[PDB]
Each structure stands twice: as structure tokens, then as C-alpha cells.
Amino acid sequence: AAQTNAPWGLARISSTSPGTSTYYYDESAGQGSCVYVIDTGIEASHPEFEGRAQMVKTYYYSSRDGNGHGTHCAGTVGSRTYGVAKKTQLFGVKVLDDNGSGQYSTIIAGMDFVASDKNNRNCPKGVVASLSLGGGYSSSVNSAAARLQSSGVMVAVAAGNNNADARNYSPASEPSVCTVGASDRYDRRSSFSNYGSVLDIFGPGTDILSTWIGGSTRSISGTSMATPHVAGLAAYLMTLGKTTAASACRYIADTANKGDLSNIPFGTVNLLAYNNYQA
């Protein structure tokens, strides 16, 4: 399948070259997979989600996304226009308040929630969790991410936006999950992207158009935007049967575009997520 005039990041993940605008992908489109977006919530009524999104958990007075961040990330995973995996099922877990903040204890609870809650959902092709959040190093936060991954969920986490070594941030620094840095449309490391040996992969993160609250759209930047590209890619590849939750991060690294990014610090992987789709 081909989506013309796609957001640059979708085009990038199906291309061996920057500078194109059509997204190419197998029509299975992540059908039968599920992606949990652990964030500020999801505006599930947005026409872009086509009834495939739902809130399953909140730790606050509402499950609605009063911020937009979680809706934007969910849109990059799986919205019809802005999403990588256009037929996946999206489940929202609101661990961040409407200012985008959350306590680590709440975030940990939300990760353990997903590890159990997947047993209440139908995801025959597999389960992914997208965590566009983080703060300073916490062994307890890393352990929660490691548990979620061990339970059979492909965990993708943002590297962080400090232009610093991600070893000092959590859950970015957890070795067993997939830690995602950000790139721009010219294949440069995004100016804010964290780096370091704990990163596994880069995805598009600068000037990413996606869904927003109020039934709207907007373009924003962050490792928060790169992470759902990788989460959606994992769901798509799991639906194709090419990999599993336990092996998807390694598979994505194996099949990435290699050595094509600029301003990658020595010791950080130079790998850009790629779907390897041949029409």
C-alpha cells in the first residue's frame, strides 16, 4: 500500500533515502496487534482513530486527554493518516496529568497494569507499549519497564530531550527495553535528542504531524514523537509475523538503515528505524 503526501516521518520509515513523501507499507497494517500508549490519555473520539482507540485506565479524575501529548503519540502509532500501524488497536493508560506530569509511583503502577491488562484484550499478533515519558534515573522505574517487557510486551521508551547521555534517565536507561532517539527530516540527530550506548534505535522526532485534542492536528518535536514510530513499527512487523515482542527491538536494529544519520556521537548506534517493505 502507498499513502501519498504522508508526514515525512512515515515516508522516512519506509525509505532507504530521506526526502520522499509517500509511505509504503503492507496492507495488514498491524491488524490483530495492540499498542498501549502510556501517557496523558487519548482522545479516542478523534475521527482519525476510527473507533480503534479506547481508554482502559486512568489514575486521575478523568481518563480524557486534557493535554494533547498522548493523543499525538497515539496518532503516530496508529491513526489513519498520521500512523505507522493504521489498523492496530490502541489502548490508553493515563499516568500523566493534563500538565504532562506524573509521579514515578503512578508510572510504575501503569506499567504493571499493562503487563496484566493485556490478558484482558485480544491481541493475537502481539502487544506493544509506547512510553513517551521519563525523568531522572530510578532503579524502580527501570525494573517496572523490565517487568513489562519480560511479560511479553514490546516496550519502546523515549531517550529523553536533554541532549545528554540517556544512561542518567529512566526508563530510557533500562537495558532490556527499546530506547528511542530522535532524528530530523535531513537525517540529522535532533538537536535535543539524548544519546549514548543505551539507545537502540532512532526514529523521526523533529516536526512530526499527528492528532491533537479537540479533533485537531499539529506538528511538534521530541523523542516522545520518535518513540511511537518505533512502537507502531513493532506492531506492524509483529502482525506480519516477522518478529515477536521479545525480539522486535533487536529485529528493528538488525533491519535498520545503518550509518545514515549525522551528528551521532561516537559510541551511539547509527541506526534509523526502517520497515523494509518492498511493494
UniProtKB/Swiss-Prot annotation:
Protein name from the UniProt record: Proteinase K
Binding residue positions for Ca(2+) 2: 16, 260
Family: Belongs to the peptidase S8 family.
Binding site for Ca(2+) 1: 175, 177, 200
Entry GO MF terms: metal ion binding; serine-type endopeptidase activity
Cofactor note: Binds 2 calcium ions per subunit.
Disulfide bonds: 34-123, 178-249
Reactions catalysed according to its record: Hydrolysis of keratin, and of other proteins with subtilisin-like specificity. Hydrolyzes peptide amides
Active site as annotated: 39, 69, 224
Claim: Isomerase is one of the keywords in the record: no
Enzyme class: hydrolase
Keywords for the protein's UniProt record, in alphabetical order: Calcium, Disulfide bond, Hydrolase, Metal-binding, Protease, Serine protease, Signal, Zymogen
Organism of origin: Parengyodontium album
Record EC number: 3.4.21.64
